[PDB]
Amino acid sequence: GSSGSSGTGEKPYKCNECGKVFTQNSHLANHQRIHTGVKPSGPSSG
Numbered sequence: 001g002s003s004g005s006s007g008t009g010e011k012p013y014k015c016n017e018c019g020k021v022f023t024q025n026s027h028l029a030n031h032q033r034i035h036t037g038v039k040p041s042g043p044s045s046g
């Protein structure tokens with residue numbers, strides 16, 4: 001199962017999605033936001 005060598009890098013917080021890194025955790029989490037659907041469902045109107 002895709003048991004290949006695609007993901008080298010020992011970091012505390014890395015956005016595997018793109019390949020970035022953030023000292024803090026929140027930074028990475030908030031960033032991952034762009035790596036997922038963000039349709040205007042809540043009280044937001046785009």
Ligand SMILES: [Zn+2]
Pocket residue numbers: 015017018019020031032035
């Ligand atoms: Zn990213």
